[PDB]
Design an enzyme around this catalytic site. Structure first.
Site, PDB file in Angstrom:
ATOM      1  N   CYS A  83      38.231  42.594  40.822  1.00 20.09           N
ATOM      2  CA  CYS A  83      37.676  42.093  39.407  1.00 20.09           C
ATOM      3  C   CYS A  83      36.569  42.742  39.126  1.00 20.09           C
ATOM      4  O   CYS A  83      35.798  43.180  40.113  1.00 20.09           O
ATOM      5  CB  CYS A  83      37.407  40.708  39.569  1.00 20.09           C
ATOM      6  SG  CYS A  83      38.657  39.519  40.059  1.00 20.09           S
ATOM      7  N   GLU A 145      33.852  34.400  31.155  1.00 18.83           N
ATOM      8  CA  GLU A 145      34.501  35.594  30.646  1.00 18.83           C
ATOM      9  C   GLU A 145      35.821  35.130  29.863  1.00 18.83           C
ATOM     10  O   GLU A 145      36.438  34.043  30.157  1.00 18.83           O
ATOM     11  CB  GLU A 145      34.790  36.215  32.193  1.00 18.83           C
ATOM     12  CG  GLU A 145      33.812  36.328  32.949  1.00 18.83           C
ATOM     13  CD  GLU A 145      34.225  37.142  34.332  1.00 18.83           C
ATOM     14  OE1 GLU A 145      34.990  36.752  34.955  1.00 18.83           O
ATOM     15  OE2 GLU A 145      33.899  38.201  34.412  1.00 18.83           O
TER      16      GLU A 145
HETATM   17 MG   LIG Z   1      34.459  43.121  41.912  1.00 18.73          MG
HETATM   18 MN   LIG Z   2      31.422  38.334  34.937  1.00 16.83          MN
END
Ligand SMILES: [Mg+2]
Ligand SMILES: [Mn+2]
Ligand SMILES: [Mg+2]
Length: 224
Positions: A83, A145
């Site tokens: 991520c 997010e």
């Molecule tokens: Mg990451």
């Molecule tokens: Mn973030």
């Protein structure tokens, strides 16, 4: 406040500029990674663009990572492949075909896992849908997010950065269920977004890796 108790390489990354978005994933500004991740700022409405990669090998095993103890948010936590955030630059702001996020993913796959850019070009990265979520790491740091969910099916060469990643492993469907039971009973930790996706979307996508289309939704932002 004062980022001196924290890992130096991670701290340098705090100067990176993230994309500030409204609740509908329209760009509204640019802000440092650090400010984007302070709970005090998230409580003021601050929300940024992000992506989550789920990489399956040709045996259909999901590559999982364990975040190093150096990570400022959710250290030590088990989580999906990779991520991060698309950067507030013209390469990664690109919204035609979500190309900017797919470029960001390719970049981070290389930085976190040492996967050569050529092994995962942006065309091999399947943008499925988006999820809005808010979660705290501790009292100071947290996440807010709209997360782009990306799927890759590729046999890759690994040399991960120990500063980013404590350990990694490929799991079958049943091995992940087993891992999720250890998380539920406090034996290991998992990130809040990985819990969200594992509980909701992941096993459905996993059963249907050949036919991912029925799952492609580029219009709806799922609120978790
Ligand atoms: Mg990451
Ligand atoms: Mn973030
Ligand atoms: Mg364009």
């Amino acid at each position: 406040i004062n980022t001196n108790h924290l890992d130096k390489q991670q701290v340098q990354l705090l100067a990176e500029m993230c994309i500030l978005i409204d609740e509908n994933d329209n760009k509204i500004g640019a802000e440092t990674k650090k400010n984007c991740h302070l709970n005090e700022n998230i409580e003021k409405g601050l929300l940024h663009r992000a992506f989550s990669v789920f990489l399956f090998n040709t045996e259909n095993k999901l590559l999982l990572q364990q975040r190093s103890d150096a990570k400022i948010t959710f250290p030590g936590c088990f989580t999906n492949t990779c991520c991060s955030h698309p950067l507030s630059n013209p390469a990664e702001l690109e919204e035609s075909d979500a190309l900017g996020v797919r470029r960001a993913a390719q970049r981070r796959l290389k930085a976190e896992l040492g996967i050569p850019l050529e092994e995962v070009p942006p065309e091999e990265i399947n943008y499925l849908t988006r999820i809005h979520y808010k979660a705290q790491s501790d009292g100071i740091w947290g996440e807010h997010e709209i997360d782009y969910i990306l799927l890759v099916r590729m046999n890759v060469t690994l040399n991960p950065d120990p500063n980013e990643i404590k350990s990694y492993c490929y799991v079958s469907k049943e091995e992940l269920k087993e891992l999720l039971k250890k998380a539920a009973s406090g034996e290991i930790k998992i990130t809040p977004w990985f819990k969200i996706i594992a509980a909701t979307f992941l096993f459905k996508w996993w059963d249907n890796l050949n036919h991912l289309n029925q799952f492609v939704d580029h219009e709806k932002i799922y609120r978790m």
